[PDB]
Design goal:
The structure is cut from a larger assembly and holds 3 copies of chain A. Chain A has one helix at 14-23. With 47 residues, the first copy, chain A, is mainly α. Chain A binds chain C through residues 38-45, and chain C through 1-2, 4, 7-9, 33-35.
């Protein structure tokens, strides 16, 4: 765990098996922010 | 978006170049000609399927 | 601000200060929206400068 949280820290499917049972349940849906975060992003109200 | 606006506007190499330049002018100049050609190829692959 | 070209948002503080003394609230809001830690910008020295001189007698 981590303090400010588990971190597998694995190298490059097998993780999903452990995740399903050990930590949390299965997902009816999934969402991904493919675009990365720029060093400076314009946080205007609409965003 | 810096490049998302390009994709939105598209949905030809000359038109792609115009859109990419107008939406992201500065970054392109740094990029080499071959690299921007490869980027145009990537954008072509994306634009193949609009559904 | 739209292009996101060449600024790390750290120097903006300087310009920011001027706005606060020149009554330009829209530019204040614009600076805050595009990334600015008012907590970090606000320091003992900045507050001292703001209160000592810019404060009307």
């Amino acid at each position: 765990d981590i303090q400010f949280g588990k971190y597998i820290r694995l190298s490059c499917e097998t993780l999903y098996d452990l995740m399903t049972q050990h930590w949390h349940l299965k997902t009816p849906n999934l969402v991904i922010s493919v675009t990365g975060g720029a060093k400076n992003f314009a946080l205007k109200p609409r965003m | 978006g810096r490049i998302a606006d390009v994709i939105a506007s598209l949905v030809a190499s000359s038109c792609v170049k115009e859109s990419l330049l107008r939406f992201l002018p500065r970054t392109i100049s740094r990029l080499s000609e071959e690299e921007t050609e490869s980027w145009i190829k990537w954008i072509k692959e994306v634009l193949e399927s609009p559904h | 601000f739209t292009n996101d070209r060449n600024w790390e948002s750290a120097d903006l503080q300087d310009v920011m200060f001027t706005a606060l003394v020149k009554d330009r609230p829209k530019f204040v809001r614009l600076f805050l929206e595009n990334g600015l830690n008012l907590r970090k910008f606000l320091t003992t020295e900045v507050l001292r400068e703001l209160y000592t001189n810019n404060f009307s007698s």
